[PDB]
Scaffold this motif. Sequence first.
Motif, PDB file in Angstrom:
ATOM      1  N   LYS A 138      75.747  18.895   5.456  1.00  0.00           N
ATOM      2  CA  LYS A 138      74.669  19.694   6.018  1.00  0.00           C
ATOM      3  C   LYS A 138      74.106  18.952   7.224  1.00  0.00           C
ATOM      4  CE  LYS A 138      72.053  20.571   2.342  1.00  0.00           C
ATOM      5  NZ  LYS A 138      71.044  21.391   1.604  1.00  0.00           N
ATOM      6  N   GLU A 139      73.856  19.672   8.314  1.00  0.00           N
ATOM      7  CA  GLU A 139      73.353  19.023   9.519  1.00  0.00           C
ATOM      8  C   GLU A 139      72.022  18.305   9.332  1.00  0.00           C
ATOM      9  OE1 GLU A 139      71.984  21.782  12.721  1.00  0.00           O
ATOM     10  OE2 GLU A 139      72.748  23.364  11.396  1.00  0.00           O
ATOM     11  N   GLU A 140      71.243  18.732   8.344  1.00  0.00           N
ATOM     12  CA  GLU A 140      69.952  18.104   8.082  1.00  0.00           C
ATOM     13  C   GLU A 140      70.090  16.653   7.603  1.00  0.00           C
ATOM     14  OE1 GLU A 140      68.508  20.212   4.238  1.00  0.00           O
ATOM     15  OE2 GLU A 140      70.081  21.435   5.178  1.00  0.00           O
TER      16      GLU A 140
HETATM   17 LI   LIG Z   1      71.062  21.458   7.229  1.00  0.00          LI
END
Ligand SMILES: [Li+]
Length: 173
Positions: A138-140
């Motif tokens: 996930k990019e987070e």
């Molecule tokens: Li994300």
Amino acid sequence: LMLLPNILLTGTPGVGKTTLGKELASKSGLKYINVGDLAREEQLYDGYDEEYDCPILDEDRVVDELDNQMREGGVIVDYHGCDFFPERWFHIVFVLRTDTNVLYERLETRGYNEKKLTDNIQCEIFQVLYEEATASYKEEIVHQLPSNKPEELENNVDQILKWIEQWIKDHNS
Ligand SMILES: [Li+]
Ligand SMILES: [Li+]
Ligand SMILES: [Li+]
């Protein structure tokens, strides 16, 4: 005992993953694992080559070798690849980035030949590992870290140690 997080340090060879991971382990107590060294120690290879005169890492065996330890938490994993690791393994992923000119000098100093130099320099300029990381997690939880000088290494160590402390607090209520 405390629940501990798992961290992935990835990025092109030469960006400083090993130096960072080892320092982080020493200053946090977490276990540092160099995947390349691990495959060599446990002979986790399948296939060879004439290409780079190096055995081919067996991804599935690497995963099986580390799973139980990863499930328990508290591991800093170092590798110039990340798409084959189970996504559940990492709580945060850092992609170390190094200016192309700086990276070239480092790899040249390591004795890389023209072929290996070009392959890795393009890997970095194309931002291959950063893309691989964002596509795999996930990019987070994926973060790029500048790694071009002792000063940035110091900033990285400090920021990650603080992240670890906050994570441990938040997950051991
Ligand atoms: Li994300
Ligand atoms: Li794989
Ligand atoms: Li960034």
